[PDB]
Structures are given as C-alpha cells and as structure tokens.
Amino acid sequence: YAWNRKRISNCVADYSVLYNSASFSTFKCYGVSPTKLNDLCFTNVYADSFVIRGDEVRQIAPGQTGKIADYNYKLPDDFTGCVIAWNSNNLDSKVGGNYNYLYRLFRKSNLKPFERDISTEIYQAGSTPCNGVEGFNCYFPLQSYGFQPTNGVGYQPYRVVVLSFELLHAPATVCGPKKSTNLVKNKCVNFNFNGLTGT
Amino acid sequence: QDVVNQNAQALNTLVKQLSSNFGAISSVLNDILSRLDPPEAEVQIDRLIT
Amino acid sequence: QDVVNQNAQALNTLVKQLSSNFGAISSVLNDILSRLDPPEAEVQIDRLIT
C-alpha cells in the first residue's frame, strides 16, 4: 500500500548489469524492447519497489484486475517501462511467517493509475457505520500475507520493481554508456541528439 | 487565385498528415524502430502505413 | 427526377451504414461503452470509427 517512488536523474543508466545479476522471475518491458534499453535517452526515470505474493505477480501489467491490481497498485494504460520481479525466499524465509506487510481488501473508490493509497486508516465495509469497532459489516482492509517457507511455491514472497520512465517530455538525461563523437558539417550524415535521430 | 489557394491547402493538409499517431505509439518511424523489436514493432509500423 | 432519386438513395445508404458491426461486438457506441471498460473497448470503438 505504501510503495516508494525513488527518482533517478542526471546519470548514465544500463541494462547489461540487469541481465546476469540474477535469473529474475520476469524482466518484461511494455512499450520498450529490453535489448535496446541502452540506446535512447529517457526523461526522469522513476523507480517503485515492493514485495507481493508469487501467484498474484501477474497483476503487474497495464490493465489487469486483482486485489493488488485494484486496491494497491494501478498502472497507466499507456505504461512505457520495464517490470523486474524475482523470487525472494532465501532472504524472506520466515518459519514463523513475516506479517509486517499490509494490503487493502475494500476501498470506496478504486485508484486511478499511479496513485498512493495512503488511506490506510479505519474503513467502513457495509451498513451500520461502526465508527471503528470492526464488527459486523465492518471488515478491516489492511490484511497481512502468508509468507513462510512451508507456504506454497506459488504463494512465496517475491520482490518486484517497476522502472517507469516517461519519454519525449523534456531535455533527456538518462541515456547510457554510448560514446560521443566530433561534429561534422555540410555532409548529409546520420545524427543522434539525445534520442532525436535522423539524417 | 482560388486554384493556387486550393492546391496550397491540399499540399499543406497532405504534409501535415505526417504528424498523427493513427493508433500507433508514436508518429516517427525512427523512434518506433529504435525503441521496439521488429516482431513487435510491425503492428505500429503497419498502423502508420495504413 | 433522377437527381433527386440519386441524392435520396445516397443519403439513405449513408444512414443505413450506421447499423453494421464492421467487426465490433455491437453497432451502438452507448452499448459498448456501458458494457466494457476503455482499455478493452478501444479496439471495438476503433473498428466502428474506421
């Protein structure tokens, strides 16, 4: 429910170090090809990381449905970026079960894409406004998970991060390790000015 | 004068048509070609072509 | 009379072309809009528009 938003800017990115770091569960990029990621210059690449259950990881896509995909995280329909998910058990194997996580069960209004669901306070489910007693027709939205090593392999905890860089918005700053070249004039040549390509 | 004006408007509209998405993710062939793999970029390129 | 007949007939055809699916699920925009969400109704509305 509380997903961080770590901005990145004014540096050089890479993708080659994100191929052999670990055999991730999924490295899937909507709107961009993951092989050409080190060729174009982006505009204020974002970063949002969290942990979810291994079977609902399918919910991370632009336009799906599911408890996380509805009440926790909403991607835009025109999402343009990569999602990287990898199984986190060796570092998240709690024999007693780690219950320091929370997600929503019911919300009055569903979230528009890219909205922090900070409404993490008491919630009302049905009739008889209960004023915070969680009785009948009042079910708490914030529920924990079942992450333990004895838990099902599809139900294991997983660490996910979504690189969501918007393109063609401002002077780009995040293009990778490509090397510059001298400037030549009065010849029909191929150029590349911060992604702006042509002849 | 109407002849010149009509031909100029026709050419202006034809050349301005080059800046519409028509459904694809962009309006520049080089962009789609440089940030998408061919087997996927075919659909965008084909929308632009049509 | 041929002029009037041809014009009325062309207009009748243009009108009646509003009730065909063109490949969509239904030939009414309100129906699709009230039966589907945008992210998967775009394709239907697009076939109708085309």
What secondary structure does DSSP assign to A51-107, as a single string? EEETTGGGG-STT--SHHHHHT----TT--EEEEEEE--TTS--TT-B----B-S--
Method: cryo-EM
Contacts of C5 (CB under 8 A, 6+ apart): none
Of A36, A80, A168, the CB nearest to B34: A36
Q: How far is C39 from chain A (nearest CA, A)?
A: 7
Nearest-angstrom CA–CA distance, A37 and A151: 36
The residues, any chain, with a CB within 8 Å of residue C16's CB and separated by 6 or more, are none
* Distance from C-alpha of B50 to C-alpha of A20, rounded to nearest angstrom: 40
What single-letter DSSP state applies at residue A110? P
| Cα gap A174→A12, rounded to integer Å | 5
Question: Which of C32, C30, B35 minimizes the C-alpha distance to A166?
Answer: B35
* Distance in angstroms (rounded) separating the CA atoms of residues A79 and A32: 10
Residues 6+ apart with CB under 8 A from A189: A199
- Interface contacts (A, B; CB < 8 Å): 27
Q: Is there a contact between B35 and A198 if contact means CB atoms under 8 Å apart?
A: no
Burial-class residue A10 by CB neighbours within 10 Å (0-12, 13-18, 19+): exposed
Token readout for B20 is 């519409």
Classified as helix, coil or strand, A163 is strand
Separation between Cα atoms, residue C18 and residue A118, nearest integer Å:
47
Chain C residues lying within 8 Å of A62, measured CB to CB: 39
Task: Single out the residue of A33, A5, A35, A25 nearest to residue A84, CA to CA.
Answer: A25
Resolution for this PDB entry, in angstroms = 3.1
Question: Which residues have a Cβ under 8 Å from the Cβ of A26 and sit 6 or more positions away?
Answer: A57, A83, A84, A85
Q: Can you name the residues that pair with A48 across neighbouring β-strands?
A: A162
Cβ separation of B35 and A40 shorter than 8 Å? yes
Interchain CB distance below 8 Å, B35 and A197:
no
Continuous H helices in C1-50: 2-16, 29-35, 38-49
Of the candidates A194, A165, A161, the residue with the CA atom closest to the CA atom of residue A43: A165
